[PDB]
């Protein structure tokens, strides 16, 4: 019926890629679509997709929303997103119509420079308390609150070294983590979009190979 977490989550790491072993070379026969559909019917819920809502963020969102329209999108907002990050998170909530459950820490991005000044700016302690307040905590805490047993993620081979070997499915912080499109290549990410009309990041066109934290993103062109 639907594969059961409590059993993997009493296993080893090395005991749960050999029971996932099988199954893994399965999906990796199937298509992102027919992964996805896969996840929803043998995988224990609730399922959830997070989005930094970065450069290729429309690929998961419209994949994972046409079969499940209420799918929890989970959105941990730093407070420090680019404007055109907000805009994009507005415009494909509206045109995907998607579930959108935002996440943040407890204080405002104002109050935290009152109480700390610029972590960003006080090296590796300073850098690992903002990653902690504004991006691990909220991505814990709306796992917790949504009872979140299966995260979908658009996590690919491609994109480093490190992660040349992602499997489709492992065990990760508790939960069921999916990538249906981890062996998809950057030629595919750009035919899904323009196949289903759907738009990248503003900046992309503005030269930004990524985008994060305005404190954070890398001056990818002079001028910036």
Sequence with gaps: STLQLSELLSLTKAEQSIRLAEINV????LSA????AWALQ???GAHAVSSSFGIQAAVMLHLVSKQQADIPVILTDTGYLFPETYQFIDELTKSLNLNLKVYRANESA???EARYGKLWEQGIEGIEKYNKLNKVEPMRRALNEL???TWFSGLRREQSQS??????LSIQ???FKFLPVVDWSNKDVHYYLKEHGLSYHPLWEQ???SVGDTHTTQKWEPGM
Excluded: H, S
């Design 207 to 209: 030269g930004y190979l």
């Design 147 to 149: 009872n979140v047993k």
């Design 110 to 112: 104002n109050w935290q």
């Design 163 to 168: 992660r040349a070997g992602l499997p489709i």
């Design 33 to 36: 679509q027919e992964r996805v």
């Design 26 to 29: 399965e999906l990796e026969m």
């Design 42 to 44: 043998n995988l224990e």
């Design 173 to 175: 912080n508790g939960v």
